[PDB]
Amino acid sequence: MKSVQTAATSWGTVPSIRVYTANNGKITERCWDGKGWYTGAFNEPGDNVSVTSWLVGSAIHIRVYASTGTTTTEWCWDGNGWTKGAYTATN
Numbered sequence: 001m002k003s004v005q006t007a008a009t010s011w012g013t014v015p016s017i018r019v020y021t022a023n024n025g026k027i028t029e030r031c032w033d034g035k036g037w038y039t040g041a042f043n044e045p046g047d048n049v050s051v052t053s054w055l056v057g058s059a060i061h062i063r064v065y066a067s068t069g070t071t072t073t074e075w076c077w078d079g080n081g082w083t084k085g086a087y088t089a090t091n
Contacts, residue, residue, distance in 0.1 A: 009053040011060050020049045020064060027066050042082055044075055063087075 004023040010016060017032040018040065027049045029040030046066030053062040062077035063085065074087030 005048060007049045007051040007064075009051045009062065011053055011055055016060070018051065018053075018062065020051055022046050022049045022066075025068075027064070042075065042077075044073070044082075046073070 004021050006022075007020045009018050014034040015032075016034075019030045020042065021028055021030070025045060025047055027042070027044050027046040029042035030037050031040040042064065044064075044066050046068050048067040050065045051062065053060055055061075059079055060077070061079075064075040064077075064082075065087070066073050066075060070091035072087065072089055072091070074085035075082050076085040
């Protein structure tokens, strides 16, 4: 059976949770901050997704690795929007 592919990260004690879903070439984001799931700003092409995040003090930083074919693009959240990161790999 086919299925979408997800990746998840969380932080703090509430917690905040972010769940990324790769579905038929598109990666979208659902978010929890303690009071209901909502659709996040992240929307980028990809058939596979992984994620990691870390705090610096109270500030969250998220890195999402979105892959199409042999190309993995890193997307970066550092508090004010998603930008493309420096990640490269020779796949």
